[PDB]
């Protein structure tokens, strides 16, 4: 079985065992790394396609993934795609930060996203041009919920909005984005709970908000690592309930 | 203050202070009264116009509402605006029936919307012409499936699909539902939500699948009979835990 | 042929010979109970599932059907669609009523509709993303303006505008809509004439102008009833001169 | 007053005087000269810039213009802007030919067209992508079925679909078109209709049904000359029966 | 043969042989006429119907087609696609005028177009509503280039925009174009582009910048007799360095 | 002045003055290590977040860049932005890998991108739900051409489409891309020559055949790797040409 034993996908390069049912996953390839040298153990480094770093090792007993998912739905509906098919990857949450765009949002409020709005026509296209709902899988929700009510964590369930536009001329979409109930935007949860509906797969995303895009205010690089560190504590004992 | 005094609105015919902050809503009025006469204590009939029924009672020593919302978005649009607006209720339980599009959603699943796709237009028009993610109120949602883990009830907790259009040449759209997980076919959760999110209001969807599209099958009278009856006792447990 | 003498309709529950070939609709169900019994002889209420009221009798010799279709399209769309296949109805007139959007268009005005605009994507989704002109049946509009020809009725021939929207945040679109010649707004008109398109029916709309919306101006609850009675008038002599 | 005195518009360069009330225009120019050469008497030639030929005489004492408008909304809406504002001319008579799309129409039938669906996205433009209803003036239409009733031609009022797209790959689109009750199809009907709403103009359209697309079927060249025949007697007549 | 001797379109009535390999084409019939009547040698007029004049001639010694397309991308498009296949004509050079949008752009500037943007839907009707790019065949734009280097014309290599409108409300969107690069606003280049990709044909458009819409200016009559025969001069040395 | 003396961008962490005027830009991160060790001179790696790195060095005593942009459209875009504005870079050349889609194109053709065709909504919401046409400088173009016409490179100048789909149900969309001219399939050359042109910089993109979608047929590794250094060839050809 050489065709199955040297089977891969083009944009990972992993044997195809070597990923965890469970995978968290930032942007940042580089945070990825980050997280799996800090909270794993016996880590291995299963794929570097493209720079795109990915990690197996355990937690507590348990098997666990981390790797980047690169910036935008089309990238990150790549790596979704091939890691709920290929590698047989089954849950996933992604650790992410966004943009706060309203005064009752506020600097290092942890976002539970229930669902993604979003701008791009990625589901348009395939969903014959019907408004889709990008939701979260409610275990893992709950089970985040769960984790941090035992935090002294600042948290918030609702949506976020998934843009395809980092840079725009001005702020009056984020202010009907906040009219409609939106909490933070960002760009790739939509893609992963799609992705997910798509595949039977279970997802999830946690992300801090990290900046007030209303307010112009930032969390210093310091802030960042402190707040990354009340999010991994999160996410890892939520993928330790997970059954198997 | 007269003009308060007399306040009403062009659809509801109640007097300012006459519901309660919680609310049932089925699409029947008809239903709407069987519930308040079958379940509540000292209940009055508290509107309506265009015999669109509301209702206001007791159940366990709390004030709880019960009103029809009618047919599809546009409808049930209008009442949900007027009761968060004007008669200030906060919380909203849509207790629905859905048509099931797989084979793996059977007769009688309770589905808990944690999401509603769309056909509607009025998303788009509000918003930009973006994705709008309807999405239900977490505490809700958590409260709803902590009291189903206490029944014999099967239940789903997912996306549903609101439609404008009951009646399709075919049920090809149908099947692209299914293969993005959609779990059931209903009309107006997707409004509720969206209303909700509009007016800081919150909001859930419970949708007992009575019909069978896919698979051409159908509950019986009295089988409707029996699953609006566990739906209700759902209901108003959630209902009894929420905040006053 | 038990199966066709138990024949009905999930959202309506007449036997299949109920209805006459004509039919006036308002959106109120209560006003059609209004209309029957003081218009009618020989009146039968021939359906009441969830509320929706409908009716048959005769008027001078012919038999006549009145019955509500609910607020909305997709409310409105289901009972069309039932009464045009199952009971074979086959003309149809909306009695309904309207808000202006200019002052040249004036509180009593009575607008028959040549045609409705629409910001539904209902018939989008049924005709392929083209514009579909919802238009009357000439007969029925011709007749129309010959009786009220022989009236004090100030009456307008023209384009309605049929919104899924109720409330709306400002008046900005109503003032475009007044640029292109709309009369006035409402939500039935196009669902009416575009289901009768598709179902070879003949059909024909008559519209109160009972509010300005622009102006701020409202008829009273008494001029209302005035008004009521001069359309009604109309109707049925209109239905009195169709072929049988 | 020179600069008044001198006045034209860049596609069209007749003097300000120069047109009637009530214009008759086909596509072709040299069939607008055929007409006017034929059927109007003191004729003289008013415009001709890019060889679009326009004429203004006299019709049993009446004043009557007729002009080539060419082919496609994009032209036409050109010639009716410049028409309907510069010129001043109130009344307007579209004389076209159409295809048909199913065997209920039949070649030599004269559309007298209520409405026109498009695929164009000019209305969209204009309208904030509502669905805008292109329709008749109801005093127009009238006259014109008044008219043909004292005649021997087997015509149709309803709706054609004005298109941007004279050729297609297939016969698909125009099965839908006849579903949805489409009687024939053509190129301007939709934008002379939209440009009279504007500019608070009345208009109607004829077609001759000159061709069957389904059924494969055409006139002779004669056999239209009999029906443009048909067709002018009649548009003249109702031009006569027009306020002054 | 004589269904292929006597085989002609409905646009254009000329025999299958007339047209030569590459054809000049402006909007105005009388433009073509005057280009061919002053430029080429041996000149026979080949096609009328609706005024749309079409000939063909020699430019030193080489065979030159020279023919009007009208105004706006659906009539445009009827001859494109004629032309194209009935009488395999392969090479088009487009030779129009245009309004510019910014100060930077000047009159009597030639603009050589690399593509076209669009508000037309006719590509989005035909490409499953994706963004199709409209651009010239690289030979024949680098021709244009090399000749005009050798001129003292001010000529520009960049983008157009073909609208369906010729008359917009205000100059908004006019500055959103030059926003983004647009040079010049027209009606034609993008259908000619779209077409050309259809049918495996060889396309260019030159475009006069003729008159300033934001600087409010305008060329005299006898400076547009001077910039065509600029606009034509380069036309032809381009189409004699085609290859045969 | 600290501030200038430390400003970077959120994905650029480089000093102001750390880019060339020009910059090739792959994909791929890693690939851009490979060109820049490979081909420059007094390399620096300037750049670093997230794995996307970017250096600068000098070839033939030129200063070039070379950085990778990531996959899809929202990556690439982000990128190009902050290169535009922030860093003053002028001109780009993508030099990337796309999918042939019909016969006629074969594996190592090199495609020259006059246009970008695209399934991504950014341009729609950017320039008011137009078609903006997406292409190339012209001089860059032709620089392109002229260097390629020295080589022995099978070459295509035309168009692609950038998709933001990577994975797709089947091949029917690709069958109409071929039928409409375009040569290749890829994802982020529409952004560049958006950007591009909202930036007023220069750009245009090569892309190899490296896999034929239709047939089924892929270069092997090494085949990759000679067919890049013929692209790397030719874009640093290209550079040298450019004003300084």
Redesign the interface.
Known sequence: NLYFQSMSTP?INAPLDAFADTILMP????RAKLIAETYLENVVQVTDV????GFTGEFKGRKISVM?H??????A??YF?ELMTTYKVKNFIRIGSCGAIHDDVKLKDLI?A???????????????????????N??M??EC?NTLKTTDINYL???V?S?????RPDEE?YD?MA???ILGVE?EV?ALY?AA??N?CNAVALCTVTDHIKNHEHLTADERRTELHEMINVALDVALKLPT
């Open positions: 944009h942007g940042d390839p580089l493209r720079g795109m770093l980047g690169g910036m935008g739905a089309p990238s509906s790549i795609h539970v229930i669902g993604a709005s979003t701008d791009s026509k990625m589901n348009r296209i395939r969903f014959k041009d019907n408004d889709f709902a990008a939701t979260a409610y275990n929700l709950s919920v369930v609702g949506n909005f843009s395809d536009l980092f840079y979409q009907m009219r409609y109930g760009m939509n799609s509906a798509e039977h």
